[PDB]
Structures are given as structure tokens and as C-alpha cells.
Design a protein around this ligand. Structure first.
Ligand SMILES: Nc1ncnc2c1ncn2[C@@H]1O[C@@H]2COP(=O)(O)O[C@H]3[C@@H](O)[C@H](n4cnc5c(N)ncnc54)O[C@@H]3COP(=O)(O)O[C@H]2[C@H]1O
Lengths: 179, 187
């Protein structure tokens, strides 16, 4: 196998990241809310929202994907006990008005798939690997209750500066989680 | 979650997500460290990342404490960047001193191949179909695939050195293993 990379991407994304960061996430958010809620305001949704563009278009700045996605504040790492993990909180605008807040990022390994297709790895091949990556990761999560409860995959096919609104897509998911 | 053929993905992941991102700027970070510390701490002449590949996938989370003959010296200037929506994601690399016969004998930028931790964790998660024996062949295949990738990345190959080894305790010194590699490159 030279380009069957999806199983390795899914297992490393879970074992080397989600498994490690998700258990401490709620306590980091509770610390943030204690620090900020009386001034900046607090975060109600305690899940990590993971953007999964099947076309592997992964800008490093979410506002490049959609100008209605605005960086709010860093979610700092937990203090070292007596590799660091930081995350980024974003607000989502609708009608030039704040409509949602959450912890939000892309599934970074989709960038590996993107880079591979830029130099015998097709874009046909890339989409099949992206889909296999997603399905393998969802299979793993479905077997991991607490990890599954502390994050949400947001999967979509669009290339993100056309008519598709990534902010609207995230907001639909946020409003669905409150359900 | 039953296809554990992960080594090809681990290699391409490590290359694109780490080596291609960190190796181009590494020499400049070492030069910047030398500039800030040369007249006090002494210079680091070897500018390559030394990457430890224990084929048994044993990765201590503190290399310095793990070995009495390997001592942390100084972190490099941090590399911070927006990464896939995480603002200011940080990549840190560390200089270590290697001791021999009790005395300092080498200094270099050093770390473990972190994907080996994934393979180790896989072999302990209670799933059927992945034992220590499967983990070893995935580790070898990961190493083999990564070296195949770097054979066609000459700039990356000139900015790092892969230190691949089996491990038996006192019949193998990691510091000795690293020193032999350092001395080979000086050649
Ligand atoms: N501290 C962190 N912050 C944010 N996300 C994190 C993270 N650590 C892990 N992840 C996520 O998990 C994926 C796999 O991590 P893993 O460490 O297994 O596999 C990593 C690791 O072997 C190496 N690597 C990446 N960042 C590193 C670092 N700061 N130090 C050492 N090695 C790193 O490159 C591989 C692929 O990296 P990539 O980013 O593409 O893919 C990462 C990233 O999506």
C-alpha cells in the first residue's frame, strides 16, 4: 500500500489527540468560564467541534474559510502538573450579529491528504481517502462513549468562497446539539 | 475499527504534519539560539534534528530523566503558527547533551518519533488482532516508509537524521548509539 493512509490518519488522530485532549476539555472550559464570564462572557457548549471538509480544503485561519467565523479567545492549556494542547474559541456571525460560540478547529490530518495530492495520488484518490478517514474515525468514536460525547464531527463536501456558508453549517449543528 | 494497517498513514502523517513543517525553519532556530547564547552557553554546530526510532515503540515521556547520560540543555526558540484553525499552535524542540565516561561528549537537537506512541497505545487498548508482534512489523514498516519518503526529499534528509534501533539494558546505551551517529555525520 503506498497511499492507503486513511487508517493511519484515523487511528493517530484518535489515539494521539482526541483520546488525550477530550477528557480534560470540560475542566478547561469551566476554568475559562470562571475567569471570563463576568466580562468576556462564557462558553455554554463544552464539546470540541471538528470541521471535516471532504475536499480537504483546510485553511489555517477559519476566517479565511468564512468571514462570519471570528476568533474569540484562546482556550489555554491546563497548567503543567506539580506536548501542550491549546484550542481556539470562535464566534459565528449571522446578519452581522453574534449567533453562536464554540470551541472549533479542523481535522488537521486532512492537510496531509491535501499535500499528498499536490505532487501517483489523485484528487479522485484523495476524496476516497478522506471518506475512509472519516468513516474509520466515526467507527472508533462510536466505540468510545466519553470521547464521542465530548466532540462533534462536522462533515461537508463543499470547497468553502462560494455560496455555501460554513458558519451557517456550524450553527445548524450547534442548535441541534442543544436539542 | 479492525484494519490496523496504519504504518503508511503514520509515515505520511509524520512527514507532512511535522517534518515538512518543522525541518525547513530548524537551522534558523538553532542559529538564533547560538546568536543569543554563544558567548555564554557555547555553540551548537550540528544543525540536524535527531529522531529516535525505538523499534519496540517504547517512548519515555521524559527523555532527559529517562537516561542519566542524556541531559536536557536548552529549548530552541519556539515555533508558533496558526494551524488548521488552532491559533498559535506551538512546536518546541530541545537540545540535549550526551555524556560518556561521565564527561560531556555531544550536544544535539534530539527527540523521539512520536508516531511510535500511537503503535504502542494500539497494542494495549484491548482490541483483538493487534499484538506486540503486529506492533513490531508496523513499526518497521513505518520506519521503512518514512525513509522511502525522505529518499525523495533531499532537503528534508539533509535536515534530519533517523536513529533506528532495537533495544535488548546495559548491553545497549542510547547515549552511545546517538554519539556514534553524531560522530558519523562529522565525517
Ligand atoms: N498538540 C496538538 N495540538 C493540536 N493537534 C494535535 C496535537 N497533537 C496531535 N494533534 C492532532 O493529532 C494528529 C496526530 O498526532 P500524532 O501525534 O499522532 O502525530 C503527529 C506527530 O507524530 C507529529 N507531530 C505533530 N505535532 C507535533 C509536535 N508538536 N511535537 C512532536 N511531534 C508532532 O506529526 C504527526 C501529525 O501531526 P498532525 O498535526 O498532522 O496531526 C495531528 C493533529 O491533528
Amino acid at each position: 500500500a503506498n497511499f492507503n493512509v486513511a487508517h493511519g490518519l484515523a487511528w493517530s488522530y484518535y489515539i494521539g489527540y482526541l483520546r488525550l485532549i477530550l477528557p480534560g476539555l470540560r475542566a478547561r472550559i469551566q476554568a475559562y468560564n470562571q475567569r471570563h464570564k463576568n466580562v468576556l462572557g462564557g462558553i455554554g457548549n463544552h464539546r470540541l467541534h471538528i470541521l471535516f471538509p471532504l475536499d480537504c480544503g483546510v485553511p489555517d485561519d477559519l476566517s479565511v474559510a468564512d468571514p462570519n467565523i471570528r476568533f474569540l479567545h484562546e482556550l489555554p492549556q491546563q497548567s503543567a502538573d506539580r506536548r501542550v494542547y491549546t484550542n481556539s474559541i470562535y464566534e459565528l456571525l449571522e446578519n452581522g450579529q453574534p449567533a453562536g460560540v464554540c470551541v472549533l478547529e479542523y481535522a488537521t490530518p486532512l492537510q496531509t491528504l491535501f499535500a499528498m495530492s499536490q505532487d501517483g495520488f489523485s484528487r479522485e484518490d484523495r476524496l476516497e481517502q478522506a471518506k475512509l478517514f472519516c468513516r474509520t474515525l466515526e467507527d472508533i468514536l462510536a466505540d468510545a462513549p466519553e470521547a464521542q460525547n465530548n466532540c462533534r464531527l462536522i462533515v461537508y463536501q463543499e470547497p468553502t468562497g462560494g455560496s455555501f456558508s460554513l458558519s451557517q453549517e456550524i450553527l445548524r449543528h450547534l442548535r441541534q446539539e442543544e436539542r
